[PDB]
């Protein structure tokens, strides 16, 4: 099975930025669509962004499109989420996810906290 390990969470001031990363291992990384989800403490886990196998096709939730950028490096088995212009409402636990097909993902990371101070 594929293992996903997120990195890069932290505390940032409103208007700032963070880059999350997620390293996949155990199977050929280029066989998987990679996605990011987030769960705010009082809401259910919601979709953030996903990227196609080759890194060309990307899709973003309305609430983050234009501020967040998803990318991948298939030689490093890593997917990235560059989060710019952060808002307090971006505060959440962010989860990496993987699936061979393009809300259901077979594999999930353990989550990393992102806190945006007002």
Numbering used by the authors: 1 to 102, 106 to 121
Question: How is this structure described in the published paper?
Answer:
Tetraspanins are eukaryotic membrane proteins that contribute to a variety of signaling processes by organizing partner-receptor molecules in the plasma membrane. Among the 33 human tetraspanins, CD9 (also known as Tspan29) is an extensively studied tetraspanin that is expressed in a wide variety of tissues and is also highly abundant on the membranes of extracellular vesicles. At the molecular level, tetraspanins adopt a common architecture with four transmembrane helices (h1–h4), intracellular N- and C-termini, a small extracellular loop between membrane helices h1 and h2 (EC1) and a large extracellular loop between membrane helices h3 and h4 (EC2). We first present crystal structures of the isolated EC2 domain of CD9 in the absence and presence of anti-CD9 nanobodies 4C8 and 4E8, revealing the flexibility of the D-loop region of CD9.
Our group has previously reported the generation of several nanobodies that bind to the extracellular region of CD9. We selected nanobodies 4C8 and 4E8, which differ in amino-acid composition in complementarity-determining regions (CDRs) 2 and 3, for further characterization. 4C8 and 4E8 bind to purified, full-length CD9 as well as to endogenous CD9 expressed on HeLa cells with apparent binding affinities in the nanomolar range. To determine the nanobody-binding epitopes on CD9, we solved crystal structures of the soluble EC2 of CD9 (CD9EC2) in complex with 4C8 at 2.7-Å resolution and 4E8 at 1.4-Å resolution, as well as the structure of 4C8 alone at 1.7-Å resolution.
